[PDB]
Ligand binder design. Structure first.
Ligand SMILES: CCCCCCCCCCCCCCCCCC(=O)OC[C@H](COP(=O)([O-])OCC(O)COP(=O)([O-])OC[C@@H](COC(=O)CCCCCCCCCCCCCCCCC)OC(=O)CCCCCCCCCCCCCCCCC)OC(=O)CCCCCCCCCCCCCCCCC
Ligand SMILES: CCCCCCCCCCCCCCCCCC(=O)OC[C@H](COP(=O)(O)OCCN)OC(=O)CCCCCCCCCCCCCCCCC
Ligand SMILES: CCCCCCCCCCCCCCCCCC(=O)OC[C@H](COP(=O)(O)OCCN)OC(=O)CCCCCCCCCCCCCCCCC
Ligand SMILES: CCCCCCCCCCCCCCCCCC(=O)OC[C@H](COP(=O)(O)OCCN)OC(=O)CCCCCCCCCCCCCCCCC
Ligand SMILES: CCCCCCCCCCCCCCCCCC(=O)OC[C@H](COP(=O)(O)OCCN)OC(=O)CCCCCCCCCCCCCCCCC
Ligand SMILES: CCCCCCCCCCCCCCCCCC(=O)O[C@@H](COC(=O)CCCCCCCCCCCCCCC)COP(=O)(O)OC[C@H](O)CO
Ligand SMILES: Nc1nc2c(ncn2[C@@H]2O[C@H](COP(=O)(O)OP(=O)(O)OP(=O)(O)O)[C@@H](O)[C@H]2O)c(=O)[nH]1
Lengths: 60, 98, 62, 459, 139, 347, 320, 99, 61
């Protein structure tokens, strides 16, 4: 119940390896679901332009 | 930096914002694409004409001859999507979802 | 009846009574006489603990 | 080296252009011959490491591993040649190509003189192994197992690459000699703390350490036998070779930081051997057994005392030859019954008499009786660990008591019992199997006479 | 980096009200950035739904910063040790608890404490020893 | 497309990009970019399918404005400096405009959104030109002006490139889409050291181009576009799948394969500049690239996916394309690691 | 070279060599109606290269020596097995139709390549745009299931769209009772056991679904049994027809360059036939497929590339 | 049916064809040579001849030399009445301690 | 024999998204020939009124 199960095969596998897989996966579904509308793409360009020029103080 | 220079670059800035703020018409975006090269032409001309950079008068025309060349292909691109979709509406310009 | 759903991952495995293989009728025919086990009978989740040469739950007189 | 590396490389075109059926013959011929040549490096001079060229050098630690790897190469050939005899000539030739290439990297890695050159080939061993476990595996979980093995090793190795090049820019050259003679005190500081963690985690994952070890039960069990040996018999020690070399610079920060690793290995080795006390797959039984032995090597390195380093190499070599043996043993049954469950094939001494005897000495070597090299390694660590702390003998011996139960457990469950009634396909053991098993245990008991050769670089 | 200077200028273990309000601003500022992107790539419903999405994203980000700044500073006062990296860990991961509180998931809250606390501790090391992430080209 | 017209149109793109690397005038740099843009659109519209028009429209709409934005910082730099020479920019906001304009011509930051679909829509051969020849012209400008770019802006955009590129590849099916996300991840790799050292950016370029061009236009030899379609190729040409895995493993960068050439050299330079957190996270997310690299190799050669009975027909025939320069290109993209001192030659 | 881009650049036009005798006529009639006989006679009368209807081993005919290979090694489906057990779970029914349709793709590509490389006409028996009516007929009879229909339609949409229709199709109508009589005069035992229901199912969807829509892009001249025997007359009608439909009236060298480039690549013309759509009738598993391929590669002449198999006796193998 | 695959054929009894089968491959004659090569190129020359080479190697990591260097150092040191081995490792006279 | 991928293993990779969700639950995979299905053609022969009605294809009638 412990040792072989719980700690191993459940816990030690769900803390380091699988959680990193889940973290890499939850937003993988996101960053690969762009709706394909040109309006949304160029609107994200506006923000990326706006935040970089002055809001992040990237000029200086 | 005088006011006449400011009004042009600011016009470019608002032209840039409207270009990437696609409404439900590709022609309007193409029209708003038309803004900057004219703003670029105007902005370039005041700089070059003011500073008496005689040879640099090249570039204003050089700017226009090719910056209009995309408009040559862009309009045909617009009529191409309007020959299969029958509409310049950009909401249907998303067939490349997957 | 399956094991209690404590989240331990036991699944739908049957909760056979905690009774060692030592508590088997020796004279009854067994397909695995060294384990007193037949064929296809769903074996205990902890068979390798209640096996003949391990923990035995046979009733002591006292 | 050039005198071992070149013959190893030249086996590659030889096997490819060899005769249709003579591939197994010729490859076995010269791989044994190359191992004989590698016996020449077992000699070491007084204190200076045996140096041949700028890029290649050997010491009293690399050479005992070099002979082990080249001696292993014939063994995987014969063990795997049973089932591989039922596919295309190119497929079989591709396998022998891959073992030859895999061995080639191991020989060049162990004698690498530059730490960067060491890391390049140390991680390069992944590619030959990864394809072995995946392509020629005989299960379905191999697909997930290969990913687990590759990603665990790589996720730890990458910080090492960043850490290694940092030493190059700051200190200068990373030659294993110039590093030793120009050791500077790595003072305690948060940047040095992560410097210590990066240079150590890469080798810890490949040990594996308790917690960073779940790739082993998946990789080793699902891997083919030609692989199932090397992932347990040589390249785990490759992580060991990395530790004993990289810790030349990590002083005195190691003693302040070693505590989480020591407790994880020293306490986890009891838990890992407890898994072996209740297991269902024979391959998994030996796999978790390897973790317990390697965990004992993990703690052994970190005291950084003369006795610990000797017992480290002694157990490191002995376990590899041992754990390789048990995988051959599990292979023989797995071919006859076509399953890995322990209780399915109870009773083998009744049907196979000598197989029980080989199983007896195999389970005895893991039991580590005196004067077997396993015992001569574990005993040295116990004394070194006891000098470090008197309490650890409770944990150190507990495994020694626990390891007796499971090491004899498959002996009782498989051999010593009534033969299973329904099974009827057990055949008299082929003379290949018995000859292979003798090739494993005869050097081990012969090595008992002269432990000085394998005792390490501090004898 | 006016907001970044606003936070880092306040000495550790003092002016906790200023440190908290600076923490809210930094947490608030990143709230607008993520929400504005979310509205852009994913078109919401009518504007009231859009600001509802914007409000939620900003609220969590501000809340994570708010409690983190509070506990990261009072810990230095109470424990009388500002230099320790743990002084950021104990509050750095509590933001993960706050994220779990607004998302209603024990697993995601606990895992976020595992990660955010480590990163928050790492940030303290970065300021202490002299770590640089965007280092200028030196060689 | 009449072959004579097709050859001329590629030559113009050949000429347009070549003009950028040989120009010393800011206008002439913008001059070839517009010609290069003007010539690719017909090349992309090779099949005239509605998807191809979608890809061409997206590519034009994201590149023409970048050339327009390109001209904007040119005059502003002209306004504050008065010289068109390709040199350091003497006005900060112009170069802040410049880096974004050049990058979104390329796509590393959220600017990258056009790369995935546009690659998918166009043909496989057309996808090659966009992804192995269009990355030199913007990099040519960035190499020349690398002296004074803001390190904060460039590295952030490089981080986002490899982080977004690797993450999106995991959830992709069409081999064209994995190609775009793999390219996005690698472009951040090559441009991360761009402010620090320029030689190892060009190192990554030649290294990345060789493997990408080889494995793109080898995929053309397989005549497949989906993971399942690529999976079937083991039965027809198992050598192709075997070669597919070698470059795929090289694509990830596992030593001693030559795909580890850039990743190694990049970490060396960033470490030399005291930037050490930057490479480690940069190296970490490279595992995401390997995962879908490894997944594709799983379905290609490492296992055997089910085939189809009608595919027995293909065994009786053979390919007709002469795989121009293909065979040598795998060799120098998976085995050239021992030739590492060749870095000095690029300087 | 084999009409590469260099060839068309240097002057290898296609419309230059086309003459009015360049026709892609097909003779497609009912089952056992002697349409093959009429197709052969038309070829003899005109300058048309006759292409008899492709079978299971037509691919074998065009490859190697033309010797038919093992049925399992060359299709895995046999026509007579479908006759005896049309409802067998082995899927020999749909596999027979699907492989035959792929054989039709090769037949069309060979006809188009010869037509566009020599200018000679071609007469076909049951061209590409014919197999779909039997698939529908076999579907309604119940020999195959619905999922066979959608898959086959998927092949038709993906592949046949890339090709172009015939000039004027020749149709032969012979009544089903006479066809059921015509099967008996043959005497091949697998050919008697076929029911009149399937024969009827062939004919009704024929006149409802092949003649109507092909008529739009290619005229149809019906020839019943009495005029199916007539062959001198039928040539006159096809000569008195200008083919004002399809793309032939507006076909140029540019599209012909693309058409020959794709057709010459025999792999490409059926590259889209092996869609990863997995059907129980068509999906050969990994072990079975691998074993058959080993059988294929061990065969003579196929071990290496054509002209490079030293087993057959290709000399100079070290210098080619 | 779903899939068209041949099942697991069998586990070929290698002993059945040749009763003296050796367990290396199908073909007897090469298989007979297979022990003749693994035994000859194994036990004979890398195990027996291998052992004699390593066991009789020229002395490894000189000890009997170091054992030799003991007696004259101790004999010299004890005979003239000087402690047989000094506490300090390196000469301390030339050591310049800080301040 | 060693385990080999079956049809149920291929369906995992066969979808338009490797790891599907509620958003991708209806995303149809792209057509295999990459030619998306042509929708209804948008051509309108304006019935000209004269005075005789006229049905034109472009300019010519
Ligand atoms: C760095 C280290 C690595 C790189 C080293 C340098 C070599 C780079 C190329 C490697 C090989 C690429 C290749 O062909 O792979 C096979 C692979 C297989 O292609 P395929 O399936 O045979 O189809 C090819 C066409 O689609 C077939 O289309 P088609 O049937 O219409 O035939 C047209 C074809 C065939 O040629 C013709 O038709 C001849 C035309 C004659 C009339 C015109 C005469 C006047 C012009 C003559 C020009 C010569 O000509 C062209 O496509 C024109 C472009 C090539 C010739 C001009 C090159 C520039 C000058 O090629 C491709 O996928 C396309 C490659 C296109 C050219 C390369 C573009 C990217 C280059 C990136 C690196 C550049 C250097 C960076 C430093
Ligand atoms: C002074 C106090 C000292 C500590 C007192 C501990 C009391 C318990 C000792 C256990 C005895 C050994 C054992 O495991 O016996 C169980 C069994 C034999 O059972 P038996 O009654 O002989 O019946 C056999 C069938 N007729 O034999 C078997 O089941 C054999 C197979 C399984 C063996 C498992 C052994 C696990 C032992 C773990 C011990 C951990 C704690 C140790 C504590 C003491 C440490 C010094
Ligand atoms: C010492 C100085 C600083 C002191 C203060 C501490 C730092 C500031 C506060 C913490 C900032 C980092 C923590 C995350 C903040 C944003 C959280 C957020 O947006 O949560 C909402 C949402 C989570 O849920 P969601 O994924 O949308 O799924 C459910 C949908 N119904 O998530 C989203 O909608 C967005 C997607 C997930 C999050 C993406 C990453 C956001 C953070 C990026 C790094 C910010 C670093 C800031 C600090 C350093 C720079 C100043
Ligand atoms: C640098 C900016 C990069 C922006 C990239 C935008 C495309 C990929 C990310 C995306 O679409 O959303 C990411 C983030 C979280 O998305 P969330 O609101 O949690 O919804 C998930 C389920 N659709 O949604 C966002 O809007 C956050 C984007 C910036 C994260 C920092
Ligand atoms: C660095 C890490 C490792 C990187 C490489 C790893 C490679 C394998 C990785 C796994 C790949 C997936 C699993 C196996 C896939 C097999 C692919 C394949 O096509 O297999 C079947 C095929 C059949 O063989 P066939 O194509 O007919 O060619 C026979 C030789 N003419 O087989 C083949 O096509 C194979 C053909 C092999 C040809 C070998 C040629 C040898 C030449 C030797 C020259 C010797 C010169 C000696 C000179 C001496 C003096 C100096
Ligand atoms: C998968 C998660 C990680 C698994 C475990 C990996 C090992 C744990 C440690 C992680 C960090 C490894 C990277 C080490 C880089 C080289 C270390 C070294 O040589 O020490 C330097 C210290 O290294 C660092 O500063 C960086 C390492 C510390 C941790 C921060 C980055 C790593 C953690 C985040 C990325 C990895 C985690 C995964 C993310 C998805 C010394 O330089 P310095 O700081 O003194 O520089 C001079 C001056 O003082 C200022 O620079
Ligand atoms: N599945 C399938 N079977 C076909 C096709 N064309 C012909 N067959 C079969 O071919 C077999 C033999 O040819 P028949 O149909 O008897 O005759 P035919 O060649 O069409 O015409 P005749 O030459 O007049 O006899 C029959 O069993 C047909 O069903 C086709 O397109 N698909």
């Amino acid at each position: 119940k412990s040792a072989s199960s719980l700690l191993d095969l459940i816990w030690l596998e769900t803390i380091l390896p699988k959680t990193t897989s889940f973290i890499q996966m939850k937003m993988s579904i996101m960053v690969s679901n762009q709706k394909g509308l040109i309006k949304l793409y160029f609107l994200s360009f506006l923000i990326t332009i706006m935040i970089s020029m002055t809001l992040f103080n990237y000029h200086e | 930096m005088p006011l006449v220079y400011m009004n042009i670059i600011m016009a470019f800035a608002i032209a840039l914002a409207g270009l990437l703020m696609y409404r439900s018409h590709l022609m309007s975006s193409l029209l708003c694409l038309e803004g900057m090269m004219l703003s670029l032409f105007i902005m370039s001309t005041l700089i070059i004409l003011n500073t008496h950079f005689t040879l640099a008068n090249m570039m204003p025309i050089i700017l226009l001859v090719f910056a209009a060349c995309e408009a040559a292909l862009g309009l045909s691109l617009l009529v191409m999507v309007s020959n299969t979709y029958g509409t310049d509406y950009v909401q249907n310009l998303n067939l490349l979802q997957c | 009846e399956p094991y209690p759903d404590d989240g331990m991952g036991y699944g739908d495995y049957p909760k056979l009574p905690d009774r060692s293989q030592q508590e088997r009728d020796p004279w009854y025919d067994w397909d695995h006489p060294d384990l007193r086990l037949n064929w296809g009978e769903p074996i205990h989740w902890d068979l390798d603990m209640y096996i003949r040469n391990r923990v035995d739950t046979s009733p002591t007189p006292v | 080296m050039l005198k071992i590396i070149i013959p190893t490389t030249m086996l590659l075109p030889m096997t490819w252009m060899s005769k249709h059926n003579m591939i197994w013959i010729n490859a076995t011929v010269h791989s044994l011959l190359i191992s004989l040549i590698s016996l020449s490096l077992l000699n070491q001079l007084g204190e200076n490491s045996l140096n041949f060229s700028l890029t290649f050098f050997s010491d009293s630690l690399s050479a005992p591993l070099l002979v082990l790897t080249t001696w292993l190469l014939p063994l995987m050939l014969m063990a795997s040649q049973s089932h591989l005899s039922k596919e295309t000539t190119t497929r079989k030739k591709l396998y022998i190509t891959m073992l030859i290439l895999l061995q080639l990297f191991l020989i060049m890695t162990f004698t690498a003189t530059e730490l960067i050159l060491f890391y390049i080939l140390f991680e390069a061993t992944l590619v030959p192994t990864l394809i072995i476990i995946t392509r020629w595996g005989n299960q379905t979980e191999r697909l997930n197992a290969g990913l687990y093995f590759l990603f665990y090793t790589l996720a730890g190795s990458l910080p090492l690459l960043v850490a290694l090049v940092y030493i190059q820019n700051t200190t200068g050259s990373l030659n294993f000699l110039i590093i030793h003679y120009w050791s500077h005190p790595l003072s305690n500081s948060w940047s040095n703390i992560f410097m210590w963690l990066a240079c150590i985690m890469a080798f810890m994952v490949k040990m594996p350490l308790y917690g960073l070890h779940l790739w082993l039960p998946k990789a080793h069990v699902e891997a083919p036998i030609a692989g199932s040996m090397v992932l347990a018999a040589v390249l785990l020690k490759l992580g060991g070779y990395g530790m004993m070399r990289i810790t030349t610079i990590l002083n005195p920060l190691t003693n302040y930081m070693a505590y989480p690793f020591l407790m994880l290995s020293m306490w986890g080795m009891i838990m890992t051997s407890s898994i072996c006390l209740r297991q269902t797959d024979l391959k998994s039984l030996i796999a978790y057994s390897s973790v317990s032995h390697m965990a004992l090597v993990i703690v052994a390195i970190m005291i950084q005392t003369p006795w610990s380093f000797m017992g480290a190499t002694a157990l490191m070599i002995a376990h590899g030859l041992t754990s390789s043996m048990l995988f051959c043993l599990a292979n023989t049954n797995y071919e006859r019954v076509h399953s890995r469950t322990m209780i399915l094939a109870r009773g083998l001494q009744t049907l196979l008499p000598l197989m029980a005897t080989w199983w007896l000495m195999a389970s005895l070597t893991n039991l580590a009786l005196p004067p077997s090299i396993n015992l001569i390694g574990e005993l040295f660590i116990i004394t070194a660990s006891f000098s470090w702390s008197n309490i650890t003998i409770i944990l150190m011996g507990m495994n020694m008591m626990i390891t007796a139960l499971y090491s004899l457990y498959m002996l009782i469950t498989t051999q010593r019992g009534k033969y299973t009634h329904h099974i009827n396909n057990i055949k008299a053991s082929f003379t290949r199997e018995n000859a292979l098993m003798a090739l494993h245990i005869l050097p081990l008991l012969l090595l008992t006479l002269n432990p000085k050769m394998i005792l390490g670089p501090l004898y | 980096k006016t907001l970044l200077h606003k936070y880092s200028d306040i000495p550790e273990g003092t002016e906790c009200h200023r440190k908290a309000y600076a923490s809210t601003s930094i947490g608030g500022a990143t709230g607008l950035i993520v929400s504005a992107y979310s509205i852009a790539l994913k078109p919401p419903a009518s504007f009231l739904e859009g600001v509802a999405r914007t409000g939620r994203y900003t609220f969590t980000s501000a809340a994570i910063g708010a409690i983190f700044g509070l506990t990261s500073c009072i810990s230095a006062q109470v424990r009388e040790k500002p230099d320790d990296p743990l002084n950021y860990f104990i509050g750095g991961c509590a933001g993960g608890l706050t994220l779990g509180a607004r998302t209603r998931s024990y697993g995601i809250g606990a895992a976020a404490c595992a990660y955010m606390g480590l990163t928050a501790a790492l940030v303290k090391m970065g300021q202490l020893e002299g770590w640089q992430v965007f280092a200028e080209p030196k060689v | 497309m009449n072959p004579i017209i097709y050859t001329t149109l590629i030559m113009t793109v050949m000429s347009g990009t070549m003009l950028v690397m040989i120009s010393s005038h800011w206008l002439l740099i913008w001059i070839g970019f517009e010609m290069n843009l003007l010539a690719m659109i017909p090349v992309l519209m090779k099949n005239f399918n509605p998807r191809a028009t979608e890809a061409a429209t997206k590519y034009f709409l994201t590149q023409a404005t970048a050339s327009m934005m390109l001209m904007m910082a040119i005059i502003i730099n002209l306004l504050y400096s008065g010289q068109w020479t390709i040199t350091k920019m003497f006005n900060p906001v112009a170069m802040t405009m410049m880096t974004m304009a050049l990058a979104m011509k390329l796509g590393l930051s959220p600017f990258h959104f056009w790369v995935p679909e546009v690659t998918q829509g166009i043909s496989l051969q057309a996808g090659l030109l966009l992804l192995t020849w269009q990355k030199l012209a913007p990099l040519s400008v960035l190499c020349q002006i690398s002296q004074s770019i803001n390190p904060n802006l460039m590295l952030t955009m490089a981080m986002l490139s490899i982080l977004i590129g690797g993450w999106g590849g995991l959830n992709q099916t069409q081999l064209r889409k994995i190609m775009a996300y793999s390219s996005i991840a690698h472009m951040g790799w090559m441009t991360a050291v761009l402010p620090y050292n320029t030689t190892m950016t060009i190192l990554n370029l030649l290294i990345y181009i060789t493997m990408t061009l080889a494995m793109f236009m080898l995929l053309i030899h397989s005549s497949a576009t989906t993971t399942l379609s690529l999976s079937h190729t083991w039965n027809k040409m198992p050598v192709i799948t075997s070669l597919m895995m070698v470059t795929l493993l090289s694509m990830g960068g596992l030593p001693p394969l030559s795909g580890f050439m850039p990743k190694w050299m990049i970490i060396q330079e960033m470490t030399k500049n005291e930037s050490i957190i930057m490479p480690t996270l940069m190296a970490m997310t490279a595992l995401l690239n390997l995962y879908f690299y490894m997944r594709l190799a799983y379905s290609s050669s490492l296992t055997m996916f089910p085939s189809t009975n009608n595919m027995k027909m293909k065994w009786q025939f053979e390919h007709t394309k002469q795989m121009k320069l293909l065979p040598t290109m795998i060799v120098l993209s998976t085995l050239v690691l021992p030739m590492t001192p060749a870095l000095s030659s690029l300087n | 070279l084999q009409y590469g881009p260099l060839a068309f650049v240097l002057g290898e036009r296609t419309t230059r060599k086309l003459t009015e005798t360049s026709k892609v006529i097909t003779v497609d009639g009912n089952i056992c109606s002697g349409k093959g006989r009429l197709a052969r006679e038309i070829a003899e009368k005109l300058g048309l290269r006759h292409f008899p209807e492709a079978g299971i081993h037509y691919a074998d005919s065009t490859t190697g020596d033309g010797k038919p290979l093992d049925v399992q090694l060359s299709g895995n489906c046999s026509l007579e097995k479908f006759y005896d057990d049309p409802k067998s779970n082995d899927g020999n029914s749909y596999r027979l139709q699907s492989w035959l349709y792929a054989s039709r793709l090769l037949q069309y590509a060979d006809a188009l390549e010869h037509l566009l490389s020599t200018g000679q006409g071609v007469v076909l028996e049951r061209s590409i745009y014919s197999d779909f009516v039997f698939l529908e007929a076999m579907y309604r009879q119940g020999f195959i299931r619905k999922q066979c229909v959608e898959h086959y339609n998927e092949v038709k949409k993906v592949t046949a769209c890339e090709y172009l229709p015939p000039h004027v199709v020749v149709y032969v109508d012979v009544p089903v009772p006479e066809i059921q009589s015509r099967i008996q005069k043959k005497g091949n035992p697998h050919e008697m056991k076929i029911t009149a229901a399937y024969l009827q199912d062939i004919e009704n969807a024929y006149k409802k679904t092949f003649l109507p829509e092909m008529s739009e892009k290619c005229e149809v001249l019906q020839y019943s049994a009495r005029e199916a025997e007539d062959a001198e007359k039928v040539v006159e009608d096809i000569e008195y027809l200008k083919c004002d439909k399809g793309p032939w009236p507006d076909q140029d060298d540019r599209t012909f360059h693309r058409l020959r480039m794709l057709v010459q690549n025999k792999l490409e013309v059926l590259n889209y036939t092996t869609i990863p759509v997995y059907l129980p009738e068509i999906t050969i598993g990994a072990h079975q497929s691998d074993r058959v391929f080993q059988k294929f590669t061990e065969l003579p002449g196929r071990k290496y590339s054509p002209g490079y198999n030293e087993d057959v006796g290709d000399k100079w193998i070290w210098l080619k | 049916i779903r899939l068209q695959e041949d099942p697991d054929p069998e586990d070929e009894n290698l002993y059945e064809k040749n009763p003296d089968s050796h367990g290396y491959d199908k073909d007897p004659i090469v298989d007979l040579w297979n022990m003749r090569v693994v035994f000859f190129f194994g036990f004979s020359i890398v195990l027996v001849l291998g052992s004699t080479f390593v066991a009789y190697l020229p002395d490894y990591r000189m000890q009997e030399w170091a054992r030799r260097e003991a007696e004259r150092l101790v004999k010299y040191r004890e005979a003239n009445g000087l402690p047989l081995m000094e506490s300090n490792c390196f000469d301390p006279n030339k050591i310049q301690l800080p301040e | 024999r060693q385990w080999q991928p079956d049809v149920e293993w291929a369906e995992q990779f066969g979808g338009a998204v490797m790891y599907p969700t509620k958003e991708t639950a209806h995303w149809k995979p792209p057509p295999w020939n990459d030619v998306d299905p042509p929708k209804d053609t948008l051509v309108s022969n304006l019935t000209l009124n004269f005075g005789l009605v006229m049905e034109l294809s472009g300019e010519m009638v």
